[PDB]
From a paper:
The yeast ortholog of SGTA, [name], is best understood in the context of post-translational insertion of tail-anchored (TA) proteins into the ER membrane. [name] contains an N-terminal dimerization domain, followed by the conserved, central [name] domain and a glutamine rich region toward the C-terminus. Importantly for its role, [name] associates with several heat-shock proteins such as Hsp104, Hsc82 (yeast ortholog of Hsp90), and Ssa1/Ssa2 (yeast orthologs of Hsp70), which can bind directly to its central [name] domain.
In this study, we report the first high resolution X-ray structure of the [name]_[name] at 1.55 Å and also in complex with the PTVEEVD peptide corresponding to the C-terminus of Ssa1, at 2.0 Å. The [name] domain of [name] consists of three [name] repeats, comprising six almost identical α-helices and a C-terminal “capping” helix (α1 = A96-N115; α2 = Y118-V131; α3 = A136-L149; α4 = Y152-I165; α5 = F170-183Q; α6 = P186-E200; α7 = E206-L225) connected by short loops and arranged in a antiparallel fold homologous to that of SGTA_[name]. All residues were built into the electron density map except for the C-terminal Val229 and the solvent-exposed sidechains of Glu93 and Asp94. The final model also contains 90 water molecules and a single BO4 ion from the crystallization condition. The crystallographic structures we have obtained clearly show a slightly more compact conformation of the [name] where helices 1 and 7 are closer to each other in the complex structure than in the unbound [name] (See Figure S8 for a structural alignment).
Numbering used by the authors: 92 to 228
The structure:
Amino acid sequence: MEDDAETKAKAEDLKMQGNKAMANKDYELAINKYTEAIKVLPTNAIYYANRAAAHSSLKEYDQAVKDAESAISIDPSYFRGYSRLGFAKYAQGKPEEALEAYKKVLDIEGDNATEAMKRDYESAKKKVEQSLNLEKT
Ligand SMILES: O[B-](O)(O)O
């Protein structure tokens, strides 16, 4: 990748800067770094999945959903976009949408699904049940 050697190095540098910010709970800075990384190289779903996580840590779930949906569109075989979508939907009180997203994680990963991925799916399913049970007039 000679033509985009500078572009890719810069996008990955920005990504790493955003990841350090995320580790330090500087979610505002992480978001700005991931946003610049996407501008430099907009074909990498990881940057959108990372930005979705930062938005969710700030309880900015509408923006997290948008970024997760972008990650899914850019790489539909990448499970993490669906995990980020499911977390944001779950936190928004949309557990049926979260369940579908976490189920897709399990379908993608198949027999390679981790116990944490299974727990995510089961948590969403439980929240569907809880939400129904809590209905009042
Ligand atoms: O547009 B909302 O995510 O239902 O508030």
